[PDB]
Design a protein around this ligand. Structure first.
Ligand SMILES: Nc1ncnc2c1ncn2[C@@H]1O[C@H](COP(=O)(O)OP(=O)(O)O)[C@@H](O)[C@H]1O
Ligand code: ALF
Ligand SMILES: [Mg+2]
Ligand SMILES: [Mg+2]
Length: 1140
């Protein structure tokens, strides 16, 4: 039943083409036209319904407008395109076009074209290839070799020899296509012809024609030029954005491919699935071209494109895997796949197919996916084409236009009534009414939200912050909860190894110092540690040495290797042959054989090695196989053969001061000799990580960043709420949150000893039940810290809705529970922001409304050298290590919202003034001069150019701007200022009528003549437009003030001075340039007083309404107790006093 089987495609229909003479805009008009021609050619029929020669133009324009509208309706809407041109088709045997309409907020619908090849029916939608499958009777996406419903056996990949037939090569090239990113940038002509059909560009040309019909030959040229240059700059912006998106692809580089039994040199854009390609060390500005699965050798890679981490990963082959009867899974073999867009740092070798090695001596891999179907390719394709636009709904600006159109319709109706009461000419009156109707619609009101976003993006890219989805910028103006991370986001990257603690557990030491609770205080340095501790520190690590001579890995592993004193070798060997205090004994060698890599959900890392070490002071020679494990103390505790007495108290005491505690464990498989080549590959993770003994805790110290406290204090006192979602110990997280002032009261930790409330000093213990609700006093008078175990056990009970509102510090959460917390906070109505820098938060970054991936990198790297280096893990990306980048996003979104509101108000108040001035001028039959209205338009354009310059303040304020148009701040201010302007204009028109009487005779001559009413109305409307620009400049509490910047203040002062000099008749040449009449002194004085009163009333109304209704209140989760407000006020007063 469904034609297209895809979650992101709603409807699809089959259509057939039709000839040109059968379209919906040919036959009805070709049957209507001869009827009108016969009516016009008939003399007796010409008198009735055609009238004079004037209404003939009206009928011709009407029929031509209907024909042009019918033609353009096929371009405006896809449904009308299918209805008019195309015709429904019965079966797939007779079909050439397909109408495809996607799901909401997933791009634009279209009419794709079927293609047939030899049987094989396919088409393209949003640069994605869909194929017709006759068995399922539906269209679906391409099916690859690794995505078969029965998972392929590993003998298919191990014994593969590449494509060996040229016919199969041609078939694969036809089926899948080349390995290129199809992102074409078109020229100016194509973009202009695509943009000159839009419904708001035809309307302005129609308005230009309407003005040209009324003998205005200087205004129409000016507005046509302005419209042309605006469309040109929009086209240039779109082309620049498309070029920036195009700059993400990888330039092709030569590679070696096994084809037809020989190693050939093929460019990187001519790769097909099933190829056997030799990989080597990649260069700068190049990555892996396509997704591959390794079959021989080992690689050391850096997957910075798909995750924010930059620590290298050790990919191994599937050569040793017994895949004769074992089906391939992606869970166990996740360490053998090379993704496209990553960099291969190192190739090491440490076959079943029976092929010679490649000439470049690289590893061998088998291609799996090519083109847009890779992970990076799919992410880029979704980013570019199928994404929500900046103004998706457009159901509020198009109603605001109708709101103005109601006023214009009322004015036009009154004009028509008062014109037909006095028996005026019907054609001129109809043209005046149409002009009044069409002179109220702002041209770019649907815009001015998609125009400020580009300026915000440029300002952000100044700060090295890049955004790939620009429709999330307004969301940053409404953030209510701002989540964070502990290690790598709020704490520094370098670590100092304090030492090894708890070596005396198990009654190893008798006179060791001990506190009241039983914790062992004494801490021993790494040099003076035991032999087993030294070997478990050396063995359980993932540090590799490049051929240049550098060491790369996790910072804590580099730190513990530097503190240990041992030296890394080329073939995964560590030795301490020199005898000195730097080696501190324990001399020997350690050679690693197999590694079980660290996983965030497992919280441990194990390693198997062959050791041969001796202790100098007490002998105790050791040799043979050995296995070392390091991880979180809670995880290691469950795997010990016997837990020592004071384990929990010791690690709790050592983590209470803010340190980081890692637990080590060791086991000896064989006492003498190696385990064996076959036995090593037969080991499993579950079997090797059991029955371990104990080694001392490694104690690290993570230093806080210099910008963490300032950024968090900026976020906290600006109607935001900041929470921490970490995976470290609850006590370390509580200490860090207390240091950065996230929590300021006593803290209670909800954790199993099941699910008890505990104090940080462990003097309060309260039992709670998962089913019963939380105690109200605990919520009222305590600060909460909810672990991962309690959050897991509170999955479906009633407590879940009350924890997420009263918890600021979540600790010990797996990467799935982070996205669980984010989804739970998003489902209650709040807006969330997440800032992470790791693979833990990748799931969480793609669920929050705003996602920042802090790519920790130095400024010197940028000085040595821009969407190429940016990743695709989060929509936002900052390339520096400063926490202050987060406020710089929430300030830019706020400025975007403020500028949008001010532009809406300015446009809506500038259109109505012109409409109701033309309405007043058309009651007496006189009209504006050509030069006067051209000068007014040029001055308004200059004012718009001058007011567009605006900067931002250096701090966040407590006032949140309104996010939408229909509030009680925009509507009320617009109506009040409109009423004031209307009252002043009506009063001055009545006074002009009183001073100079009207002859009530409108002659046939329509040549413009100078008059008092025309000059007064023109001067008043100019001054009113300038006052509207000067008053509604929304830049007092969020941007720079009006008088602080000369760029617009000088222009406003100059325009007002010129207008008042024209009013005061100081320059008669300027008065005669715009055809102004001489004034008497009393009229000049009364007009000046009227203008001053108008400006003062508008300013007072705007100020009152801004001070009353502009502030959108903070949510209930962001409200602060009076104690914190008092502390903030006291600290701010002290800072102000100590400033000078
Ligand atoms: N390279 C590593 N080797 C062993 N254990 C680690 C390593 N990295 C982190 N751990 C431990 O895993 C636990 C969970 O860490 P995780 O939540 O994955 O990241 P983070 O420590 O940034 O929150 C931590 O308590 C830490 O002690
Ligand atoms: F320190 Al983390 F997720 F990076 F808890
Ligand atoms: Mg992190
Ligand atoms: Mg990490």
């Amino acid at each position: 039943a469904p034609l297209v089987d895809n979650p992101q495609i709603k409807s699809a229909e089959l259509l057939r083409p039709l000839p040109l003479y059968q379209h919906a805009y040919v036959w009805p008009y070709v049957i209507v036209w001869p009827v009108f021609l016969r009516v016009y050619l008939t003399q007796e029929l010409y008198d009735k319904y055609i009238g004079a020669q004037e209404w003939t133009f009206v009928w011709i324009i009407s029929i031509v407008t209907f024909q042009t509208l019918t033609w353009l309706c096929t371009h405006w809407s896809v449904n009308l395109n299918a209805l008019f041109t195309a015709k429904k088709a019965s079966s797939i045997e007779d079909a050439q076009l397909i109408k495809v309409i996607p799901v909401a907020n997933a791009g634009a619908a279209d009419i794709c074209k079927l293609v047939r090849d030899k049987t094989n029916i396919s088409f393209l939608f949003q640069k994605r290839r869909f194929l017709w499958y006759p068995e399922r009777k539906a269209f679906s996406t391409l099916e690859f070799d690794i995505d078969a419903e029965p998972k392929p056996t590993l003998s298919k990949f191990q014994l593969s020899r590449g494509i060996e037939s040229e016919d199969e090569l041609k078939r694969l090239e036809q089926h899948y296509g080349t390995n290129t990113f199809d992102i074409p940038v078109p020229t100016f002509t194509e973009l202009f012809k695509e943009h000159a059909v839009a419904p708001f560009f035809v309307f302005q040309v129609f308005c230009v024609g309407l003005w040209l019909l009324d003998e205005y030959w200087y205004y129409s040229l000016f507005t046509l030029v302005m419209l042309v240059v605006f469309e040109s700059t929009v086209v240039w912006q779109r082309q620049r954005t498309l070029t920036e998106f195009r700059s993400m692809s990888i330039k092709p580089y030569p590679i070696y491919v096994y084809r037809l039994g020989k190693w050939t040199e093929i460019q990187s854009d001519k790769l097909l699935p099933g190829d056997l390609v030799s990989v080597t060390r990649t260069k700068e500005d190049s990555g892996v071209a396509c997704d591959m699965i390794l079959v021989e050798g080992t690689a050391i890679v850096n997957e910075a494109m798909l995750s924010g981490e930059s620590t290298p990963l050790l990919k191994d082959s599937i050569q040793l895997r017994p895949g004769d009867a074992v089906l391939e899974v992606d869970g166990l073999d996740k360490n053998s796949l090379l993704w496209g867009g990553t960099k291969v740092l190192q190739i090491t070798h440490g076959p079943a197919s029976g092929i010679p090695p490649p000439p470049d001596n690289g590893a061998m891999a088998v291609v799996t996916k090519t083109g847009f179907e890779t992970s990076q390719g799919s992410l880029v394709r979704t980013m570019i084409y199928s994404t929500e636009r900046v103004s998706a709904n457009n159901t509020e600006a198009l109603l605001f236009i109708l709101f103005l159109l109601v006023f214009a319709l009322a004015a036009s109706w009154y004009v028509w009534d008062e014109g037909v009461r006095k028996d005026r000419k019907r054609s001129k009156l109809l043209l005046d009414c149409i002009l009044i109707i069409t002179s109220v619609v702002p041209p770019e009101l649907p815009m001015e939200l998609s125009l400020a976003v580009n300026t915000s993006l440029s300002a952000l890219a100044k700060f090295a912050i890049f955004c790939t989805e620009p429709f999330r910028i307004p969301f940053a103006g409404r953030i209510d909860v701002a989540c964070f991370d502990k290690t790598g986001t709020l704490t520094g990257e370098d670590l100092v190894v304090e030492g090894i603690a708890g070596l005396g557990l198990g009654h190893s030491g008798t006179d060791t110092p001990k506190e009241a609770d039983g914790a062992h205080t004494r801490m021993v340095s790494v040099h003076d540690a035991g032999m087993e501790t030294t070997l478990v520190l050396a063995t359980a690590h993932a540090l590799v040495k490049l051929d240049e001579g550098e060491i790369v890995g996790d910072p804590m592993e580099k730190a513990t290797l530097n503190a240990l004193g041992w030296v890394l070798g080329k073939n995964d060997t560590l030795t301490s042959k020199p005898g000195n205090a730097a080696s501190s004994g324990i001399l020997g060698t350690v050679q690693i054989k197999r590694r079980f890599q660290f996983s965030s959900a497992l919280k441990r890392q194990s390693s198997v090695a062959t050791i041969t070490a001796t202790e100098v002071k007490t002998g105790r020679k050791l040799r043979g196989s050995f296995v070392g494990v390091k991880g979180a103390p809670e995880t290691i505790m469950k795997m010990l053969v016997t837990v020592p007495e004071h384990y929990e108290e010791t690690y709790k005491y050592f983590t209470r001061r803010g340190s980081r505690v890692l637990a080590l464990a060791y086991k000896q498989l064989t006492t003498e000799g190696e385990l064996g080549a076959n036995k090593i590959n037969d080991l499993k993770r579950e079997s090797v990580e059991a029955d371990l003994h104990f080694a001392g805790f490694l104690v690290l110290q993570c230093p806080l960043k210099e910008d963490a406290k300032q950024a968090v204090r900026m976020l906290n006192e600006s109607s935001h709420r900041v929470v921490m979602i970490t995976g470290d110990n609850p006590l370390t997280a509580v200490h860090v949150a207390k240091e950065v002032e996230i929590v300021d009261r006593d803290v209670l930790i909800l954790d199993a000893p099941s699910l008890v409330w505990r104090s940080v000093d462990d003097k309060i213990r309260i039992d709670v039940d998962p089913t019963k609700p939380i105690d109200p006093e605990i919520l009222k008078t305590k600060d909460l810290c909810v672990t991962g175990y309690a959050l897991n056990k509170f999955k479906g009970q009633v407590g879940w809705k009350s924890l997420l509102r009263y918890t600021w510090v979540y600790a010990r959460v797996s990467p799935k529970q982070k996205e669980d917390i984010l989804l739970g906070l998003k489902d209650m109505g709040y807006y969330t922001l997440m800032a992470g820098d790791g693979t833990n938060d990748v799931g969480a970054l793609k669920q929050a409304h705003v996602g920042v991936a802090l790519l920790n990198g130095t400024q010197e790297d940028l000085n040595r050298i821009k969407l190429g280096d940016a990743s695709v893990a989060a929509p936002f990306t900052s390339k520096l290590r400063n926490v202050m980048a987060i406020p710089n996003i929430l300030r830019q979104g706020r400025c975007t919202l403020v500028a949008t509101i001010q532009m809406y108000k300015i446009l809506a108040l500038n259109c109505l003034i012109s409409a109701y001035s033309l309405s007043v001028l058309y009651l007496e039959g006189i009209k504006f001069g050509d030069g006067q209205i051209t000068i007014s338009g040029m001055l308004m354009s200059v004012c718009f150019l001058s007011i567009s310059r605006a900067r931002s303040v250096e701090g966040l304020s407590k006032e949140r701007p309104q996010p939408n148009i229909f509030n009680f701040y925009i509507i009320g201010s617009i109506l009040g200022q409109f009423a004031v302007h209307v009252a002043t204009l009506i009063y001055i028109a009545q006074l002009c009528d009183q001073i100079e009487p009207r002859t009530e005779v409108i002659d046939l001559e329509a040549e413009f003549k100078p008059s008092l009413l025309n000059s007064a109305v023109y001067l008043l409307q100019l001054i009113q437009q300038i006052s509207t620009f000067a008053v509604n400049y929304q830049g007092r509490p969020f941007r720079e003030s009006l008088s602080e910047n000369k760029g617009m203040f000088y222009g406003i002062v100059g325009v007002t001075a010129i207008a008042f000099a024209c009013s005061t008749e100081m320059l008669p040449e300027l008065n005669e340039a715009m055809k102004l009449v001489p004034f008497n002194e009393n009229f000049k004085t009364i007009m000046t007083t009227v203008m001053i009163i108008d400006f003062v009333a508008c300013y007072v109304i705007e100020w009152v309404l801004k001070k009353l209704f502009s502030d959108l209140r903070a949510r209930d989760i962001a409200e602060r107790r009076p104690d914190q407000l008092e502390r903030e006020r006291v600290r701010k007063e002290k800072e102000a006093r100590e400033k000078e």
